[PDB]
Design an enzyme around this catalytic site. Structure first.
Site, PDB file in Angstrom:
ATOM      1  N   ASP A 130      -2.319 -18.560   2.030  1.00 49.24           N
ATOM      2  CA  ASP A 130      -3.353 -19.382   1.365  1.00 49.24           C
ATOM      3  C   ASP A 130      -3.839 -20.529   2.239  1.00 49.24           C
ATOM      4  OD1 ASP A 130      -0.673 -20.338   0.718  1.00 49.24           O
ATOM      5  OD2 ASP A 130      -1.305 -21.150  -1.185  1.00 49.24           O
ATOM      6  N   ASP A 142     -10.968  -9.579   7.365  1.00 47.45           N
ATOM      7  CA  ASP A 142     -12.332  -9.654   6.809  1.00 47.45           C
ATOM      8  C   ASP A 142     -12.907 -11.057   6.805  1.00 47.45           C
ATOM      9  OD1 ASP A 142     -12.750  -6.897   6.682  1.00 47.45           O
ATOM     10  OD2 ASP A 142     -12.024  -6.731   4.684  1.00 47.45           O
ATOM     11  N   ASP A 184      -5.303  -7.379   5.933  1.00 48.84           N
ATOM     12  CA  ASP A 184      -6.476  -6.709   5.381  1.00 48.84           C
ATOM     13  C   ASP A 184      -7.448  -7.788   4.866  1.00 48.84           C
ATOM     14  OD1 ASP A 184      -8.002  -4.493   4.628  1.00 48.84           O
ATOM     15  OD2 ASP A 184      -6.709  -3.878   2.945  1.00 48.84           O
ATOM     16  N   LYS A 187       4.135 -15.540   2.857  1.00 48.66           N
ATOM     17  CA  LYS A 187       4.310 -16.367   1.668  1.00 48.66           C
ATOM     18  C   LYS A 187       5.824 -16.553   1.408  1.00 48.66           C
ATOM     19  CE  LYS A 187       1.674 -18.477  -1.385  1.00 48.66           C
ATOM     20  NZ  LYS A 187       1.779 -19.930  -0.928  1.00 48.66           N
ATOM     21  N   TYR A 195       0.802  -1.234   0.000  1.00 47.45           N
ATOM     22  CA  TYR A 195       0.000   0.000   0.000  1.00 47.45           C
ATOM     23  C   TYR A 195       0.846   1.302   0.000  1.00 47.45           C
ATOM     24  CZ  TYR A 195      -3.709  -3.255   1.325  1.00 47.45           C
ATOM     25  OH  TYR A 195      -4.644  -4.271   1.385  1.00 47.45           O
TER      26      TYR A 195
END
Lengths: 355, 356
Positions: free
Chosen positions: A219, A247, A243, A187, A142
């Protein structure tokens, strides 16, 4: 004295804040410490009074406080202002920046009495889901170098050791007072930045030999949150991955009105708020769920004031209230308590257990 | 019409389940009056043992000479100790994907009414019917961009080109055309410049597909919606990173790993079709492995490489009906089940029963 800047804001904010203040006032009595609770305007309230969403006097109050207990901002009345002056953009973002609030903590606890409201089968969650998502807010993709071209575009997932170290310390400190486990979500099988995460976190972990550190790919973590979420305690995530998973955790929880959030720095300062938004369409009624605001006040006790037992008492009161069937309209549409009745129910349970 | 298939059954359960896929395809060729040329070759551990490498030059040439690869599963304990780049999976699939420019991975997530209990989602969440296709770009983005590991700083680069986006988008729309006519483009366009480019390119590709409903959704919202309300999805078009995450989330909500299949496609109708699951070495000698994932890979191969859409549909419906009759392998019902060959035969019998 524990100095709290109380910024209740707009719509349902003042109405739910009243209940949190009611609970904190009792808690200060029980534990024989004092709050200085300075209420000050924020958001729409502040635009009306002072012309801006965050005034200099209100900012200075925050600087003189030990934490910010924040409600909700925004509503139709201010939706027509220039985008940069609107309540939310002009209040939360500058506060996070001013105070270097680099860590977001979002708990995901599913209450036994609200297992029906999770989208996951009861058998999947039956051992108990109690997770804390700890998300880095200042680094990565970001904020890295990016470019939009006609034929090509990129963004850059960049992190420093300083950024990783300070969020890792927050995560381990949480794990120490929860269930003593951190999963670093990354990752590392392909990302250089994830390899740095593992190196820095493994080094921070030397100071926390009481904590079990595990590593999991993002994942697999997305799968495990659906298939077997009771394994998690603290989940330490990069900005992007946090992020996404925060959720997903909200989704498996099922009860959005109970979700809270803490944005912390490295000096015990935090901004504590409900996860959910404004609710202008029910602002005139007396039905908003105050539990998220009350649970934000608990998080503030636990993380800014180190009053762990006080926090725990509030959390156990909410658990017992819900176990007795005492709930607001969002949680049980057929039989419910108004906002102030819900606050009073919690207060009474706190008094009943004060022997 | 002769369809040439390279059959690379591999290790563990691969050869056993492949037999059942070939049984079904043989019947399909008879029903539809076309022929298969099926050439079987070693791959993976089998190939390391016979030829010293996981993919031999002659096996590669055979693939080049074929119309698609029907792949089983590779890997097992015997080769788990080799260097990471020489292990059966890494040394077979990756070179194949490169050789044949297989830039698109298609993974269906269909929850069968008879197996709703096996999903971790409450029945009420999924009751309207979940039938999703994840379309994941394999060649671009953060896994291949410039990266550096330093002592104090490290980075990776999420880079995409218009060429990369356009080709995967076309694959997604072509799938949506023959499914439920909806694409969700999954991105993070509120903050990523690369996601802004995705939206630009995809919206332009979409002009050729005015029959398809295109919607956009942020990746974080998509992670929520897969849990809360997955029946809304048809085709889910994803970048490499986002697809990697959401494909696993979709596997999770599905609940029945043994039914899950995968296709890796290029832009010329060539594909490698395989079960999503692994080679299950510990049950390889038994006759209980679920052949349905392998059979469903064969159907995907029919649909996407051979354009035999009805033949594919007939196989898919035969599976639906067999499950709806309670005919299942051990992994799906531990108390009352069929062996691998019995399961194959059951599907075959249903295909024959509906051939009027």
């Amino acid at each position: 004295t524990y100095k709290v800047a109380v910024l209740a804001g707009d719509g349902i904010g003042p109405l739910v804040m009243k209940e949190a203040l009611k609970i904190l006032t009792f808690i200060a009595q029980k534990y024989n410490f004092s709050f200085e609770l300075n209420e000050a305007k924020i958001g729409g309230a502040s635009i009306d009074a002072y012309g801006v969403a965050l005034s200099d006097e209100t900012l200075k109050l925050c600087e003189q406080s030990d934490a910010i207990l924040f409600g909700s901002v925004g509503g139709p009345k201010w939706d027509n202002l220039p985008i940069d002056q609107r309540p939310e953009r002009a209040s939360l973002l500058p506060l996070r920046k001013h105070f270097n609030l680099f860590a977001n903590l979002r708990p995901c606890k599913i209450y036994e009495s609200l297992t029906h409201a999770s989208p996951l089968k009861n058998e999947i969650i039956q051992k108990g889901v109690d997770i804390l998502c700890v998300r880095e807010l200042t680094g990565g993709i970001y904020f890295g170098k990016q470019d939009l071209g006609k034929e090509s575009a990129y963004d850059t997932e960049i992190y420093t050791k300083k950024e990783i170290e300070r969020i890792a310390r927050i995560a381990f400190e949480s794990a120490r007072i929860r269930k003593k486990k951190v999963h670093l979500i990354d990752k590392a099988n392909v990302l250089a930045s994830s390899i740095l995460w593992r190196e820095v976190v493994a080094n921070v972990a030397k100071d926390y030999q009481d904590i079990n550190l595990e590593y999991m790919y993002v994942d697999n973590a997305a799968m495990q949150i659906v298939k077997n979420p009771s394994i998690f305690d603290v989940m330490l995530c990069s900005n992007l991955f946090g992020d996404i998973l925060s959720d997903e955790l909200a989704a498996i929880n099922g009860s959005l009105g109970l979700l809270s959030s803490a944005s912390l720095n490295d000096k015990g300062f935090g901004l504590y708020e409900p996860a959910g938004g404004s609710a202008p369409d029910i602002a005139h009624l007396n039905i908003a769920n105050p539990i998220a605001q009350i649970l934000s006040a608990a998080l503030m006790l636990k993380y800014s004031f180190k009053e762990e037992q006080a926090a725990q008492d509030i959390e156990n009161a909410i658990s017992l209230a819900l176990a007795q069937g005492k709930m607001t309209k969002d949680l049980n549409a057929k039989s419910y308590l108004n906002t102030d009745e819900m606050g009073d129910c919690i207060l009474e349970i706190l008094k009943e257990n004060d022997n």
